[PDB]
Ligand binder design. Structure first.
Ligand code: ANP
Lengths: 444, 50, 100
């Protein structure tokens, strides 16, 4: 990141070891003015020892703790360190973090760099004794995407397969590469690169017709598995800006959409890479960023530039809003299909008004119930009945058969069974006496 | 750029390493997670004693 | 399941459940200082086998509890299946935009 290292070589050896060859300035090998030994032995044998504690050597860098290389050395049965600087080659052998010999000079050269090869200890790692190709491949690929011009070479001495990645398009090209197995909806990809209040941000996002959410949280070329505050600000900014756009354009008024945050991020692939001078990570794995000023900066930048994008491209804006409305209508249609059946499991209509005309008496086993045609018969039936112990329930046409189409969910009227019992019956035995009047024709 | 030497390697003695990078030792110090994690660790030590 | 015609996935059977898992390991393995995630697989296998024994014993020793839990699982599975079916059908074919 200081603009000196332009080539990094990672080689997987057959003896279960990985060597990292870079062409940077090189690890300092001089005698430390306080420890008494070479700075390499200091950073290998002392926790929280290095030059990443300020901006004097590294203005912007992802490493901020100072224990990582010590962890790599200690959890390895053996480690070889070759450092090239000032025309001298410094070599030292480590075993379980214990230096076997002081840092000695083996020769001279004109290049500058550092070789770090370690044999990982089997006493700590279980069920995984061999390095996996796919994870390292993805890591180096995305690293080459986020680092334009930095050549990254991966060698594998186990099978001879070697790759070289020197992408210069950036995270835009990264998103384009990740959209090779998908189907995007808009050609123009949202992309920018700003730097406000000492903190830089670079986000590239693109909507695709899939249904998987994959927002790669990157902070100083470091992936965050658990996201962080920057991810929360990203999501909040996207949600609020999309809501404001759909409200001011009238889509939420035409479609009556709540437009929650989860529907706004449905089928979206984002790559958020921020540059922070002094970040804050909750662990060494750097899975979460806990810097809220970065959250606010990224939120403001996303709101501003995403509103600009949505108001400068009418076609892409229309397509994105249509996809968001499609996802929201899918969610609410599923909510309908769930709670409508949940209510059909219970009784809500009850068919009490409209047609049912009970009597004055409320004690069952004293009143009577009848079932006739509604408009043709029920009128005269009510005009000629009594108002003491008489009740009539009209009907409409015919009733579907039970055996021909048996379905516990199929229901059209449901008024009869709901008004006579609760549908089970020993509890409510209202209208103990029922009489069915019917015409003398064949349809009767 | 070019400020690299043995003096650039800084070693934090005592608890200076924890105060310099509280994140890997306490969590988040802004949302209130670490302020409660203080008492969480204290009470967990008490329960481990119990 | 022969009559219900459901899948009964993991996220569906655990819907509407409040469980508490308290394990006791001599040498823990936490992936961070905050101790928010355990990385011990021996504890995983131990808890797994203890569950496969004792939860099975519990479900075969209590018919009423077993039938109530299975009824809840059937309800949830039918709900999610009908939801997926209706959602897909409406969105892909039944969706009619431009109400005018
Ligand atoms: N490849 C390297 N090139 C140059 N200097 C290095 C390199 N690796 C380690 N160092 C030096 O050794 C110190 C300790 O390294 P390291 O432990 O990886 O720091 P770190 O990145 O903060 N680890 P962490 O933050 O926990 O992931 C650094 O601060 C550097 O001064």
């Amino acid at each position: 990141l200081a603009g000196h290292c332009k080539e990094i070589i990672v080689t997987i050896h057959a003896d279960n070891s990985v060597s990292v060859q870079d062409d940077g300035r090189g690890i300092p090998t001089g005698i430390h003015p306080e420890e008494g030994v070479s700075a390499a032995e200091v950073i290998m044998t002392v926790l929280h020892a290095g030059g990443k504690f300020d901006d004097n050597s590294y203005k912007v860098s992802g490493g901020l703790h100072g224990v990582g290389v010590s962890v790599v050395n200690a959890l390895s049965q053996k480690l070889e360190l070759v450092i090239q600087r000032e025309g001298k080659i410094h070599r030292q052998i480590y075993e379980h973090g214990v230096p076997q010999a002081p840092l000695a000079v083996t020769g001279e050269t004109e290049k500058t760099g550092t070789m770090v090869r370690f044999w990982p200890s089997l006493e700590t790692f279980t069920n995984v004794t061999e390095f996996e190709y796919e994870i390292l491949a993805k890591r180096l690929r995305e690293l080459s995407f986020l680092n334009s011009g930095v050549s990254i070479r991966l060698r594998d001495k186990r099978d001879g397969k070697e790759d070289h990645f020197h992408y210069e398009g950036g995270i835009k090209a990264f998103v384009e590469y990740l959209n090779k197995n998908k189907t995007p909806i808009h050609p123009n990809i949202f992309y920018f690169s700003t730097e406000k209040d000492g903190i830089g941000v670079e986000v590239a996002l693109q909507w695709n017709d899939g249904f998987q959410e994959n927002i790669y949280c990157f902070t100083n070329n470091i992936p965050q598995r658990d996201g962080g505050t920057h991810l929360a600000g990203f999501r909040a900014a996207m949600t609020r800006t999309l809501n404001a756009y759909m409200d001011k354009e009238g889509y939420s008024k035409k479609a009556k959409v709540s437009a929650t945050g989860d529907d706004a991020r449905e089928g979206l692939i984002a790559v958020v890479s921020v540059k922070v001078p002094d970040p804050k990570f909750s662990s060494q794995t750097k899975d979460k960023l806990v810097s809220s000023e970065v959250k606010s900066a990224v939120e403001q930048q996303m709101n501003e530039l995403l509103a600009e994008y949505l108001l400068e491209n009418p076609t892409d804006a229309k397509i994105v809003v249509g996809k968001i409305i499609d996802a929201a209508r899918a969610r609410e249609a599923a909510r309908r299909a769930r709670e409508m059946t949940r209510r059909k499991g219970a009784l809500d209509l009850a068919g009490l008004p409209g047609k049912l005309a009970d009597c004055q008496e409320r004690d069952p086993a004293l009143s009577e119930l009848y079932l006739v045609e509604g408009d043709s018969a029920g009128g005269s039936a009510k005009q000629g009945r009594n108002r003491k112990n008489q009740a009539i329930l009209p009907l409409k046409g015919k009733i579907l058969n039970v055996e021909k189409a048996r379905f516990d969910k199929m229901l059209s009227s449901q008024e009869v069974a709901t008004l006579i019992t609760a549908l089970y019956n020993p509890d409510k035995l209202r209208y103990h006496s029922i009489i069915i009047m019917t015409d003398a024709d064949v349809d009767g | 750029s070019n400020s690299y030497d043995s003096s650039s390697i800084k070693v934090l003695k005592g608890l200076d390493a924890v105060r310099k990078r509280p994140g890997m030792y306490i969590g988040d110090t802004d949302d209130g997670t670490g302020l409660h994690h203080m008492v969480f660790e204290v009470v967990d030590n008490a329960i481990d004693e119990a």
